[PDB]
Amino acid sequence: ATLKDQLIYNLLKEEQTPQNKITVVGVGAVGMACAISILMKDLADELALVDVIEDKLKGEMMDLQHGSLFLRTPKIVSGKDYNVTANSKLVIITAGARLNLVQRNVNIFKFIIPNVVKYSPNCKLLIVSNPVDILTYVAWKISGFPKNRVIGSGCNLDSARFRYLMGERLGVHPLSCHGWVLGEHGDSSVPVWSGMNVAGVSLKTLHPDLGTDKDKEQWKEVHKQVVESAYEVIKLKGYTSWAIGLSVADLAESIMKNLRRVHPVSTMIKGLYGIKDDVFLSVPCILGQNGISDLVKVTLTSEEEARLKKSADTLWGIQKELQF
Amino acid sequence: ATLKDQLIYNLLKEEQTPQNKITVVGVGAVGMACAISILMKDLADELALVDVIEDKLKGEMMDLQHGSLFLRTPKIVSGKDYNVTANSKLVIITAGARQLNLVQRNVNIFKFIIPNVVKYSPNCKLLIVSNPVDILTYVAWKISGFPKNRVIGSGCNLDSARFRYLMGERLGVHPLSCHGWVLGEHGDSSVPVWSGMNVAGVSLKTLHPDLGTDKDKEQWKEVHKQVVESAYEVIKLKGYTSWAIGLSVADLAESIMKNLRRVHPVSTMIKGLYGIKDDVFLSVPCILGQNGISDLVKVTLTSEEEARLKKSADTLWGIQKELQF
Amino acid sequence: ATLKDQLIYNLLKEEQTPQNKITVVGVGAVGMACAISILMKDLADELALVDVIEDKLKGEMMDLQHGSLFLRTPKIVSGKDYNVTANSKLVIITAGARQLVQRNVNIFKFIIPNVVKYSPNCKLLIVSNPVDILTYVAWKISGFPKNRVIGSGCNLDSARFRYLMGERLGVHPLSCHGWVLGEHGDSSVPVWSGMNVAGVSLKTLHPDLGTDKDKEQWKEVHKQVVESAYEVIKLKGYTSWAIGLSVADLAESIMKNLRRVHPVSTMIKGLYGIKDDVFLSVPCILGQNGISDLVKVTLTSEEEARLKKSADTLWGIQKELQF
Amino acid sequence: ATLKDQLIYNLLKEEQTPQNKITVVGVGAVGMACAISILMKDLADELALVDVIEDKLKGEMMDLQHGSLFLRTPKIVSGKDYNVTANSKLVIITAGARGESRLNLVQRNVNIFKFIIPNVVKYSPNCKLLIVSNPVDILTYVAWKISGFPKNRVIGSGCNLDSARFRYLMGERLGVHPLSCHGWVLGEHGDSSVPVWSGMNVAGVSLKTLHPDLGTDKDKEQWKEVHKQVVESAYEVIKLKGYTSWAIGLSVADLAESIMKNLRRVHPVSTMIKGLYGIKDDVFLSVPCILGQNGISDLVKVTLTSEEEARLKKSADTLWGIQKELQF
Ligand SMILES: NC(=O)C1=CN([C@@H]2O[C@H](COP(=O)(O)OP(=O)(O)OC[C@H]3O[C@@H](n4cnc5c(N)ncnc54)[C@H](O)[C@@H]3O)[C@@H](O)[C@H]2O)C=CC1
Ligand SMILES: NC(=O)C1=CN([C@@H]2O[C@H](COP(=O)(O)OP(=O)(O)OC[C@H]3O[C@@H](n4cnc5c(N)ncnc54)[C@H](O)[C@@H]3O)[C@@H](O)[C@H]2O)C=CC1
Ligand SMILES: NC(=O)C1=CN([C@@H]2O[C@H](COP(=O)(O)OP(=O)(O)OC[C@H]3O[C@@H](n4cnc5c(N)ncnc54)[C@H](O)[C@@H]3O)[C@@H](O)[C@H]2O)C=CC1
Ligand SMILES: NC(=O)C1=CN([C@@H]2O[C@H](COP(=O)(O)OP(=O)(O)OC[C@H]3O[C@@H](n4cnc5c(N)ncnc54)[C@H](O)[C@@H]3O)[C@@H](O)[C@H]2O)C=CC1
C-alpha cells in the first residue's frame, strides 16, 4: 500500500464532472486578470485555460495552482486542446493580440468558436477580444447559438469608467452614481444623459445643459475622459488588465449565480431603434443562467438613436465583407 | 451654483487621516498582484502605490481606479513622492527587479525606500517581499530602527503555500486541510518540517517513518524538491511569478489589518533560537496581529533541521556583516 | 514553564486598542440579526454586546464566540456595563422591547450618555422605534454633530420596495431603483419620479405611475411595504433578517468609508420648508464621518406636503418631551 | 402593453432547473441560523424552506425575501408541501424541538423522519442529506436507512460544532485564532464525544509531545477541562438564552460550502464507521471526512489510543442498542 491509502480510506472513486465551470481563452493581459477576478469572487468550481503559446499557458496555470490554498476553486486546468473546456457554463474569449485587427481575429475565431461549441454546446459565450461588437457577431454566426447565449462585453467597461469619473466629480461612490454608456464599444459609444442620476434625481433635469457643448461645467468631458483614459493607460502601462478583469468577473457573477441584474452588454440589436442589419450593440441586459434573457428598451433621443444606427451601418459594412 | 452644489448639500467638508491604509512599493509583476488580491479581499480603505517609473505607476493606478465600481476601496492613490504613503498601517516592499548582485543592488534601493516610508508612516508594519527576502528584511529592520515585531518578511509563506498545494495534489485533499511547514531561509535553502506534516492531526511521519528521507519508497522528499523546481519552472514558462505570491501577501495583510492573531510562516529575528546568536531573519510560525509579530511558535526541530537553520544563519550573516548602509 | 510558554515565545504583551469596533445595544430579535450580518460581512475586528438581561446577553455572546472558527472577527465581548463599548467606531441602538415613544426615551436617557462616555468619537446608528423621533432624542442627549447621528429610517422601507418592484418586473432588487423617503413606517413617501431600471423612468413610460388612475395599480407596491411589515409580525411574531441585513449594509458604508447614498433619517431642518429640529429619511452619503452630505431630491407638492405633515406631527411629540 | 412590456423586451421565457439549490427542513432556531449563514456565504441560487407551522414558515420566508437586495440568492421559496424542495443539491434537516428523556426524543424524531426523508428523496433523489436534528448520530442512520441513499450522500453534523467549540476554547487558552489552533473532537456528538489529544497542535507542533500529560487526569494545567467546557458551554447557552443558533448555523454553512463548491476539505462529520475501530454494527460516528460534490468521498483513518477506541466502541454499542429497537 501507500501513505495515501494508509492515511485515507476511500468510499467512492468516480472522477466526478464539475457543476460550475468557466473557461478563459487567451491567457493574455486581459485573460489573466479575468481569471484572478473570477477565482477571488468564488464563481467557478473548475477553471480551464486555453492558449496557442503552450509555455506561457503552463506557467500561468501553475502560478494560479500555487495560490490554491488562498482560493475556493479546487480545479485549475489548462491546454492547447479544447478537451480541457468540456462542459463549461461560461466561455470567455480574450484571445488574439492588442480592418487588419478585424480580419486577423476573424481567422483566430474560425478555430476558437467551433472548438468551444464542440466541447461545451450549451455554454454562454462572453466575447472580450476587440472589436468586441464585430467579433460578438462573428462568434454568434460561427457558433449558431441563439442570441441570448452570445454575450459581448461591449460598453460594460465604458459604463464602469463613466460611473468612476461621475463618482469622482460628485464625491459619491460609483455604485451610487448611475449612468449608462451604450451602443458601439470604444470611441463611438453613446452617453445616455437622460439616465444619468444619483438617488433617482435626473442630472439632466437639474442641469439642462448636461452633455451639450453649451455646458459651463463641461459634463460632456466625463464621456470624453472615458475614451481619453483608455488610450492614456495604453500610453502609460502598455496594456489594460485590472479594470476589464473586474468588469468581466461582474458579468460572470450575474451569469453563474443567475442574479438577473441589468448590465451594459453587446447584443443582437436588429429590430430595435430602426436597425435592420445583423449587428451587435450594447444595451442594458438582464443577465441570468441563460445569458441575455431580457433587454431594457431605453428611450433614446433622435440624436442618440441616429448614433446607434450609424454605428450599426458602419459595423455591417465591415461584417458583410467578412469571409467565414 | 454647480450641479454638485445643486444636487448635494454638504454637512462637513471632511477629512479624517487614513484609517486602514496599505502601501505597495514597486508596482511590478509581484506588487500589482499583491494590490489586486488586497483590493478584492477588502482589506484597505486607502491604497497607495509607489514606483520609480512614473508612467507605469500612473497607468497601474488609473487601471485600478477604473475598477472602483467592482471594489470596496474608495481611495487608490499613487506617486514617486512618499507623501502619498502617509499614515499607512501596512507598507509592502515589492521593489527592485527579478534577477550577491541582487543583494547589493536591492540594498542600495532600500537605502532610499525605508527612510522615506518611516518618515510618513512611523507606526506602520513593514512587509518585505523583494529578494533575498530574509536578508532584505534585516536591511529594512536596521535602516528603519523599528522593533522586531513591526518588521515582517514574506519568507517561507509562498514556500509553505506551494508545499501544501503539492501535498494536497498527492493526497487528493484541499491545501487548506493539508498541513505542512516549510521554515528557515526562503528559496532553495528552505527546510521541510516532516514532523509537522499532517492531515486532521494525523502525523504523516508517524505513519510513514521514511517521510522526507533518502530511503523514502514513495519519495516524499520530492514534494519539497518540486517547491524549488516549480519556482524556476514558472520563471522558464511565463517569465515571472505574480498570482501565487500576490494571494499569499494578501493573506498575511488580512491577519495584520484585521488583528486575526493567525499563525503564518514568515521571516523574523531568529536570534536567541535554535543556537543562532546572530542578527538574522528566518521563517518560523508567527502570530500575526495589529502589532505584527506579537508571538512566535517554538517548533521542535531535529538536529539535522536545526543544523540547516544554523547554516542558513551563518551564510546570511556573512553577507549582512559586509553590507554598507 | 506552562505549555503556552513552551509552545509560544512572546515578543510583546502591550496596547491592544480596537481599530474597527462595533457595538450592538439591545441583543433582541433585531439586535442579534444585525450582529450576525455584521460578523459575516467582516466589518469589525471587535464586537461588543450590551443588554439589561444579563443571562440572554451572556448566552448570545457565547453562541457567537463558538462560531469564531467560521468568522474573521477575533474579539466578541458583552456586558451590562458600557466599559465593554470603549473605543467603538459605530454604536447601534436596537434596545427596548417592540410594541413606545416615552418608554424608549427613558431607556435612551441612560443608554446614550453611557455610549458617549466610552466612545465619544463614534457614529450612532438608531434602529429603536419610532426611529425618526428616537434619532432626535439620541442627537439631543449625545450633543454629537448632525453627521454622527444616523437613523435607520426608510432604509428597510426602500429595501422592501425594491424587492416588490423587483418581483413585479422580474429584475434583481439591485437593478430596480426606487426611493422611499420621509417618516419611517406607515407615513413613508414613495418617490415615483425616481423609480427606474437602467436610468429609464417608469413614470415617463407610465404617466399614471403611483396615482389612482393606474390600471396596473403601482401604488400597491408601496401599500404592500406597509402591509408586509404587519404581516411578518402576524406570521412569525417579529422581524429580524431583513432589518439585520439592512443595518449591516449601512455599517459597511460607514466602516469602509464607501461614500454610498442610502435612505437614512437625518436632521431635515432647512429642507422642504421644514423649520423644526426633526429627523426624516433622505438619500445620504455614508462614510467614516457618517452623513457627510445629503441628496436634494426634487419632490412634488404632494410629496413635500407629506414630509411637512410628518415633520409637524413629529415635532408636536418632540416639543413635549422632557430632557 | 404593460409597463413591464414597455420597459423590457423578452428574448426567452425558458425557465430552467435550479443549478445550486439548498433546502432547510425545520425553520426553527437552528434552521433559520443555517439559512442566513448559507445566504450570506452565497452558496445557493435557490433556497427552499419546509416546516409544519405554515404561518412561521411564510413569515421567515418573507423576512429573508425582503433582504434580497443585500443577498446574492435570487430565489427564496417555502412550503409545507415538499414540491418546493425539487432539484436540491443539499437538503438540511433541522426539524425537531430540542425536561424530556433522550429515548422519547429518538422515536419522536423518527416519527417525524418517517415523513420527511421519503418526501425529500421523492423530489430531490440525487441530493446530499445533512442531518442536524438530535440525536444526530442516531438520526443520520435513520435517514440513511429510510432514504436508501449510499453512505456518501448521508452526512451527519456530528462533532463539527464540538470541534468548532474546542478550537475556540484552545484558541482562548493559547491566545491564537481558532483557525490556527488544530484539534479534533470525534465519535458520538454531545457528552460522549472524544477529544483526540494526539492530533491537538499549533503549526504542526504536537501539544501531547511537548506536554505528555495532555488530556490526562495527571495534567498539571488540566487541559482535559478544554473538552469538559465544550460540554458545559452547550448546556450553559441553553440555561442562559434557551437555545443555540449562531454557532451551529455557521458550522452547517461551512459544511455546505465544501459540498456545494466541491472543496474536498476534511471535516469532523458523522458517517458509517462500520469495519473501523472494531465496530461491526450499522452505526454513524464522527471521523474526519473529505467533503465534495458527492458528499463523503473519503475518510481519514485517525490513529486512536486503546482508551479512545474503547469510547468509540462503547458509543457504537450504545447507539446500536437504540437503533435495533427502532421501527421503519
Ligand atoms: N472592454 C473591452 O471589450 C476590452 C477589450 N480588450 C481586448 O482584449 C483582447 C486581448 O487583450 P490582451 O490580453 O491585452 O492581449 P494579449 O496580447 O496580452 O493576449 C492575447 C492572448 O491570446 C492568445 N491567443 C492568440 N491566438 C489564440 C488562439 N487561436 N487561441 C487561444 N489563444 C490565442 C495569445 O497567445 C495571447 O496570450 C484584445 O483584442 C483587446 O483589444 C481590452 C480591453 C477592454
Ligand atoms: N516569496 C517571495 O518572497 C517572493 C519574492 N519575489 C521578489 O519580488 C521582487 C519583485 O519582483 P517582480 O515584481 O517580478 O519584479 P519587477 O521587475 O516586475 O518589479 C519591480 C518594480 O520595482 C520598481 N522599483 C525599482 N526601484 C524602485 C524604487 N527605488 N522605489 C520604488 N519602486 C522601485 C521597478 O520600477 C519595478 O516596477 C523581486 O525581488 C523578486 O525576487 C518574487 C516572488 C516570490
Ligand atoms: N426599520 C426599522 O427602523 C426597524 C426598527 N425596529 C425596532 O427595533 C427595536 C428592537 O426590536 P426587537 O429586537 O424585535 O425587540 P426585542 O423585544 O426583541 O429586543 C429589545 C432588547 O433590548 C433590550 N433592552 C431593553 N432596555 C435596554 C437597555 N436599557 N439597555 C440595553 N438593552 C436594553 C431588551 O432586554 C431586549 O433584549 C424596536 O424598537 C423595533 O420597533 C424593528 C424593525 C425595523
Ligand atoms: N451539533 C448539532 O448537531 C446540533 C443539533 N441541534 C438540534 O437541532 C434540532 C432543531 O433545534 P431547534 O431549531 O432549536 O428546535 P426548534 O424547536 O426551534 O425548531 C424545530 C422546527 O422544526 C419544525 N418541525 C417539526 N416537525 C416538522 C416536520 N414534520 N417537518 C418540518 N418541520 C418540522 C418545528 O415546527 C420547528 O419550527 C434539535 O433536534 C436540536 O437538538 C442543536 C444544536 C446543535
Ligand SMILES: O=C1C[C@H](c2c(Cl)ccc(NC3CCOCC3)c2Cl)CC(O)=C1Sc1ccccc1Cl
Ligand atoms: O477597447 C479597449 C482596447 C484598449 C487598447 C488596447 Cl488593449 C491596445 C491598443 C489600443 N489602442 C491603440 C494603440 C496604438 O494606437 C492605435 C490603437 C487600445 Cl484602445 C484598452 C481599453 O481600455 C479599451 S476600452 C475603451 C477604448 C476606447 C474608448 C473607450 C473604452 Cl472604455
Ligand SMILES: O=C1C[C@H](c2c(Cl)ccc(NC3CCOCC3)c2Cl)CC(O)=C1Sc1ccccc1Cl
Ligand atoms: O523567490 C522567488 C523569486 C523567483 C525568481 C524571479 Cl521573480 C525571477 C527570476 C528568477 N530566476 C533566475 C533568473 C536568471 O537566472 C538566475 C535567477 C527567480 Cl528564481 C520566482 C519565485 O517563484 C520565487 S519563490 C521560490 C524560489 C526558489 C525556491 C522556492 C521558492 Cl517558493
Ligand SMILES: O=C1C[C@H](c2c(Cl)ccc(NC3CCOCC3)c2Cl)CC(O)=C1Sc1ccccc1Cl
Ligand atoms: O417599524 C417596524 C416595527 C415592526 C413591528 C414590531 Cl418589531 C413589533 C410589533 C409590531 N406591531 C404590532 C404587534 C401586535 O399588535 C400591536 C403592534 C410591528 Cl409593526 C416590524 C417592521 O417591519 C417595522 S418596519 C415598517 C412598519 C410599518 C410600515 C412599513 C415598514 Cl418598513
Ligand SMILES: O=C1C[C@H](c2c(Cl)ccc(NC3CCOCC3)c2Cl)CC(O)=C1Sc1ccccc1Cl
Ligand atoms: O446537541 C446539542 C443540543 C443542545 C440542547 C438543546 Cl438545543 C436543548 C436542550 C438541551 N438539553 C436539555 C435541557 C432541558 O432538559 C432536556 C434536554 C440541549 Cl443539550 C444545545 C447544544 O449546544 C448541543 S451541542 C452539544 C451538546 C452537549 C455536549 C456537547 C455539545 Cl457540542
